[PDB]
Scaffold this active site. Structure first.
Site, short mmCIF file in Angstrom:
data_model
loop_
_atom_site.label_atom_id
_atom_site.label_comp_id
_atom_site.label_asym_id
_atom_site.label_seq_id
_atom_site.Cartn_x
_atom_site.Cartn_y
_atom_site.Cartn_z
N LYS A 18 7.97 -11.16 7.31
CA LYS A 18 8.18 -12.52 6.82
C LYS A 18 7.65 -12.72 5.40
O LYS A 18 8.17 -13.55 4.65
CB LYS A 18 7.52 -13.54 7.76
N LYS A 37 7.59 -2.42 -2.36
CA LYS A 37 7.41 -3.62 -1.55
C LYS A 37 7.63 -4.89 -2.36
O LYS A 37 6.99 -5.10 -3.39
CB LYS A 37 6.02 -3.63 -0.91
CG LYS A 37 5.79 -4.78 0.06
CD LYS A 37 4.59 -4.53 0.95
CE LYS A 37 3.32 -4.36 0.13
NZ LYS A 37 3.12 -5.50 -0.81
N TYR A 87 5.24 6.71 -0.93
CA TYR A 87 6.21 6.77 0.16
C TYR A 87 5.74 7.72 1.26
O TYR A 87 5.38 8.86 0.99
CB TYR A 87 7.58 7.20 -0.37
CG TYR A 87 8.60 7.47 0.71
CD1 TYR A 87 9.06 6.45 1.53
CD2 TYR A 87 9.11 8.75 0.91
CE1 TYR A 87 9.99 6.69 2.52
CE2 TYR A 87 10.04 9.00 1.89
CZ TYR A 87 10.48 7.97 2.70
OH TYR A 87 11.41 8.23 3.68
N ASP A 131 -8.33 -5.17 8.84
CA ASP A 131 -7.04 -5.31 9.52
C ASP A 131 -6.43 -3.97 9.97
O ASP A 131 -5.31 -3.64 9.60
CB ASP A 131 -6.05 -6.03 8.61
CG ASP A 131 -5.00 -6.80 9.39
OD1 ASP A 131 -5.34 -7.32 10.48
OD2 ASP A 131 -3.85 -6.90 8.92
N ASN A 136 -0.12 -0.73 10.22
CA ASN A 136 -0.63 -0.41 8.89
C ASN A 136 -0.94 1.07 8.74
O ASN A 136 -1.58 1.49 7.78
CB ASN A 136 -1.89 -1.23 8.59
CG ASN A 136 -1.61 -2.72 8.52
OD1 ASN A 136 -0.52 -3.14 8.12
ND2 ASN A 136 -2.60 -3.52 8.89
N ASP A 149 -1.91 -0.98 4.45
CA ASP A 149 -2.07 -2.36 4.02
C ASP A 149 -3.53 -2.76 3.79
O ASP A 149 -4.41 -2.44 4.59
CB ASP A 149 -1.44 -3.30 5.05
CG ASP A 149 -0.94 -4.59 4.43
OD1 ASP A 149 -1.54 -5.06 3.44
OD2 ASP A 149 0.07 -5.14 4.93
C1 LIG Z 1 9.83 3.27 8.61
C2 LIG Z 1 10.09 4.60 7.95
N1 LIG Z 1 10.92 5.54 8.43
N2 LIG Z 1 10.92 6.59 7.59
C3 LIG Z 1 11.68 7.79 7.76
C4 LIG Z 1 10.08 6.34 6.58
C5 LIG Z 1 9.54 5.08 6.77
C6 LIG Z 1 8.59 4.45 5.89
N3 LIG Z 1 7.97 5.07 4.83
C7 LIG Z 1 7.13 4.15 4.22
N4 LIG Z 1 6.28 4.25 3.12
C8 LIG Z 1 5.53 3.19 2.69
C9 LIG Z 1 5.61 1.95 3.38
CL1 LIG Z 1 4.66 0.63 2.85
C10 LIG Z 1 6.46 1.82 4.50
C11 LIG Z 1 6.57 0.58 5.23
C12 LIG Z 1 7.67 -0.29 5.23
N5 LIG Z 1 7.37 -1.31 6.04
N6 LIG Z 1 6.15 -1.13 6.57
C13 LIG Z 1 5.48 -2.04 7.48
C14 LIG Z 1 6.11 -2.03 8.87
C15 LIG Z 1 5.41 -2.63 9.95
C16 LIG Z 1 5.97 -2.64 11.23
C17 LIG Z 1 7.19 -2.07 11.46
C18 LIG Z 1 7.90 -1.45 10.40
C19 LIG Z 1 9.29 -0.80 10.63
O1 LIG Z 1 10.23 -1.23 10.02
N7 LIG Z 1 9.51 0.34 11.57
C20 LIG Z 1 10.80 0.86 11.72
C21 LIG Z 1 8.43 0.92 12.34
C22 LIG Z 1 7.35 -1.45 9.11
C23 LIG Z 1 5.63 0.03 6.07
C24 LIG Z 1 7.24 2.96 4.93
N8 LIG Z 1 8.15 3.16 5.96
#
Ligand SMILES: Cc1nn(C)cc1-c1nc2ncc(Cl)c(-c3cnn(Cc4cccc(C(=O)N(C)C)c4)c3)c2[nH]1
EC number: 2.7.11.1
Length: 254
Positions: A18, A37, A87, A131, A136, A149
Site C-alpha cells: 500500500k 522501490k 536486488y 520490525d 523483510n 526493510d
Molecule cells: C519476489 C521475488 N521473486 N524473485 C525471483 C525475486 C524477488 C525479489 N527480489 C527482490 N529484491 C529486493 C526487494 Cl526490496 C524485493 C522486494 C519486493 N517487494 N518486497 C516486499 C514483499 C513483501 C511481501 C510479499 C512480497 C511478494 O511480492 N512476494 C511474491 C513474496 C514482497 C521485497 C525483491 N523481490
C-alpha cells in the site's frame, strides 16, 4: 551522485504494498541489475512518516553486511520518491515459507545464524531493526539471508512479531530483536507465529501473557532456544552471542 528515472529501465513488479511498489530495474550505462522501490509523496505526508524514509535512508545506507540488503542511493521525481536497493535473486523468505509450509531444522538454524550475525552487527552500531518479519527477509544468489526493510528502525500496526515491552508502550532497547528472533525461529519450524490470533485484541494479550504452545514435532533443542528468547522480561533474554553458541544452533547451523 544524484540520479534520475531516465537512468533506469523498469521491469517486472517484484512486490506490491500500500505504501508504494517495488520493481526490477537496470541502469542503462552499467547494465546493473537492482531493485527500484517507488514511494508516493502524497501518502508519505498523509501518514507523516517522513522520519522513517529519512531514517531508512540514513541508517541502511551506511550499514554494510553480507546479510543486509544494501541501499545504494536515492532520488525523487517531481511526483514520487524512488529508492535504489540491492536486488535479491531468490526472492523472499515469506513466499519460500508458504511454498514449503515449514522449514527443516537445518534451514531454520542456518537462517537464525545469518540473522544473528546481521543483528550482532546492527546492535554494535546502536541500531535496532525492531520490525523483523519474514516479509523483510530476502535471499541472495547463494540463498543467503538478507535483511531488507528499515522503514521502522532507530537508535536506542501489525503485532505478531512485536515484544511485550513495545506493544504496551514501554521504553524498548536492542532486546526487542531477540524476541523477534525467537518468534521468527518458531514460525520457521511450525509455519505460524506463536501468538497469532484472529483479532488484534486477542493477539495483544497472547503476547503480553506470553502464551504459546509447541506442536509435537518440535524437537527439545529448539523448544529450549525459543523459550529462552521469548521471555517476558527483556533481561532474561540471551545475548546474540550465546544464541550462536546454543547447542541446537551449533549442531544445526551451516
Ligand atoms: C519476489 C521475488 N521473486 N524473485 C525471483 C525475486 C524477488 C525479489 N527480489 C527482490 N529484491 C529486493 C526487494 Cl526490496 C524485493 C522486494 C519486493 N517487494 N518486497 C516486499 C514483499 C513483501 C511481501 C510479499 C512480497 C511478494 O511480492 N512476494 C511474491 C513474496 C514482497 C521485497 C525483491 N523481490
Amino acid at each position: 551522485r544524484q540520479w534520475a528515472l531516465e537512468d533506469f529501465e523498469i521491469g517486472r513488479p517484484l512486490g506490491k504494498g500500500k505504501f508504494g511498489n517495488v520493481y526490477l530495474a537496470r541502469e542503462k550505462q552499467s547494465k546493473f541489475i537492482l531493485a527500484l522501490k517507488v514511494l508516493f509523496k502524497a501518502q508519505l505526508e498523509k501518514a507523516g512518516v517522513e522520519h522513517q524514509l529519512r531514517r531508512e535512508v540514513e541508517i541502511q545506507s551506511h550499514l554494510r553486511h553480507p546479510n543486509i540488503l544494501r541501499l545504494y542511493g536515492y532520488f525523487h521525481d517531481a511526483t514520487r520518491v524512488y529508492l535504489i536497493l540491492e536486488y535479491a535473486p531468490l526472492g523472499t523468505v515469506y513466499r519460500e515459507l508458504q511454498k514449503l509450509s515449514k522449514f527443516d531444522e537445518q534451514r531454520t538454524a542456518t537462517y537464525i545464524t545469518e540473522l544473528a550475525n546481521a543483528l550482532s552487527y546492527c546492535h554494535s552500531k546502536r541500531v535496532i531493526h525492531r520490525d523483523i518479519k519474514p516479509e523483510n527477509l530476502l535471499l541472495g544468489s547463494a540463498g543467503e539471508l538478507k535483511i531488507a526493510d528499515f522503514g521502522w528502525s532507530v537508535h536506542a500496526g501489525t503485532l505478531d512479531y512485536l515484544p511485550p515491552e513495545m506493544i504496551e508502550g514501554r521504553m524498548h532497547d536492542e532486546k526487542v530483536d531477540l524476541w523477534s528472533l525467537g518468534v521468527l525461529c518458531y514460525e520457521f519450524l511450525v509455519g505460524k507465529p506463536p501468538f497469532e490470533a484472529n483479532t488484534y485484541q486477542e493477539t495483544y494479550k497472547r503476547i503480553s501473557r506470553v502464551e504459546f504452545t509447541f506442536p509435537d514435532f518440535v524437537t527439545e533443542g529448539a523448544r529450549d532456544l525459543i523459550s529462552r528468547l521469548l521471555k517476558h522480561n527483556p533481561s532474561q533474554r540471551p545475548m546474540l552471542r550465546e544464541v550462536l553458541e546454543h547447542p541446537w544452533i551449533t549442531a544445526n547451523s551451516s
